[PDB]
From a paper:
The endonuclease domain is at the N-terminus of the PA subunit and has a core fold similar to other two-metal dependent nucleases of the PD…D/E…K superfamily. Here we describe high resolution X-ray co-crystal structures of the 2009 pandemic H1N1 (pH1N1) PA endonuclease domain with a series of specific inhibitors, including four diketo compounds and a green tea catechin, all of which chelate the two critical manganese ions in the active site of the enzyme.
To avoid the problems associated with this flexible loop, two of the six structures described below (those of R05-1 and EGCG) were determined using a truncated form of the protein in which residues 52–64 were replaced by a single glycine (Δ52–64:Gly). For R05-01, crystallisation was successful with the Δ52–64:Gly truncation mutant in the P6222 space-group. R05-1 has a similar configuration to R05-3D, with the two arms occupying pockets 2 and 3. Pocket 2 is characterised by stacking on the side-chain of Arg84 (e.g. benzene of R05-3A, R05-3D and R05-1). Pocket 3 is characterised by stacking on Tyr24 (chlorobenzene of R05-3D, R05-1, cyclohexane of R05-2, resorcinol moiety of ECGC, base of rUMP/dTMP). Most interactions of the compound arms are with residues in the range 24–38 (notably Tyr24, Glu26, Lys34, Ala37 and Ile38), which comprise a flexible loop leading from the C-terminal end of helix α2 into the N-terminal half of helix α3, but Arg84 and Phe105 are also involved in some cases. Due to the hydrophobic and aromatic nature of the arms, most interactions are van der Waals or stacking and there are no polar interactions.
Author numbering: 0 to 52, 74 to 139, 141 to 195
């Protein structure tokens, strides 16, 4: 059962935030179990990305109002243009917002989908469960070790799902 997998694979904080995000956005984690797993995974990557730095402000994982309050605050103190859509992080070193993508498909495919969706100051960084990444301008932002740890965690999630015969379902759900 994917729902039970998610509850054993991710730390309690992450699972809580994923459940809250789903309800805030209408969804039931008991039904949309692949989505529930994807949201946890994406949350964890965002937190790991941010912990590898206080270089980053984490925007993902906050309730909508707080997320926009933070984004507004950053825009007001940097003059960086306000994004049309909530991004995932702000990079205080490069002074740009970052959109983090996690895909079960090819990274170039998901990159295009994201870049098309969001539109040009927001830096995009895409990770696969295959150790692939693609980023705006091939600027991967983090050092090699930080990206390697993210890649390892994603691949580990995939294999833990594969252990329980849940990977194939999860992969086709995107
Ligand atoms: O696709 C991403 O890489 C990504 O960063 C997605 C997001 O930020 C989502 C996350 C989300 C998805 C589904 C659900 Cl049910 C809830 C939240 C989905 C896109 C829209 N937004 S959102 O624009 O940030 C609005 C939001 C904020 C907080 C909680 C719920 C909703 C939240
Ligand atoms: Mn997001
Ligand atoms: Mn994202």
């Amino acid at each position: 059962a994917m729902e039970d997998f998610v509850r054993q694979c991710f730390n309690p904080m992450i699972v809580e935030l994923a459940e809250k995000a789903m309800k805030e956005y209408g969804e039931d984690p008991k039904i949309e179990t692949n989505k529930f797993a994807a949201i946890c995974t994406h949350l964890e990557v965002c937190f790991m990305y941010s912990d590898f730095g206080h270089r980053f402000e984490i925007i993902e994982g906050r309730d909508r109002i707080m997320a926009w309050t933070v984004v507004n605050s950053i825009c007001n103190t940097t003059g960086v243009e306000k994004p049309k859509f909530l991004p995932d992080l702000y990079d205080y070193k490069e002074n740009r917002f970052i959109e983090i993508g996690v895909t079960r498909r090819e990274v170039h495919i998901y990159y295009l989908e994201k870049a098309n969706k969001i539109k040009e100051k927001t830096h995009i960084h895409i990770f696969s469960f295959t150790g692939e990444e693609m980023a705006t301008k091939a600027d991967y932002t983090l050092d090699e070790e930080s990206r390697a740890r993210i890649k390892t965690r994603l691949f580990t999630i995939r294999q833990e799902m594969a252990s329980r015969s849940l990977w194939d379902s999860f992969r086709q759900s995107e």
